[PDB]
Design a protein around this ligand. Structure first.
Ligand code: SF4
Length: 83
């Protein structure tokens, strides 16, 4: 069950970025974002995931202020967690 402030499928930014709370139901292979092979990409290893926001599998994303993403999700702004 998603938190009340989870990013949802009719959020206009979710649509533009092709966000899905489940990376296995995403277009990460088509996007081929750099940094890791696409099958290895999800929010937990993305630079914009905020691990001090949320709880459990539902964490912050800098690009979605006031909301929570799922650590197992993905979107086209995926960027390797480098620091
Ligand atoms: S920017 Fe990164 S953390 Fe935020 S939704 Fe997209 S893949 Fe997940």
């Amino acid at each position: 069950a998603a938190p009340a402030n989870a990013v949802t499928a009719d959020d206009p930014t979710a649509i533009a970025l092709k966000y899905n709370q489940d990376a296995t139901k995403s277009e990460r292979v088509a996007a081929a974002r750099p940094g890791l092979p696409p099958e290895e990409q999800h929010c937990a290893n993305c630079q914009f995931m905020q691990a001090n926001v949320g709880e459990g599998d539902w964490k912050g994303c800098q690009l979605f202020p006031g909301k929570l993403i799922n650590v197992n999700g993905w979107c086209a702004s995926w960027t390797l967690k480098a620091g």
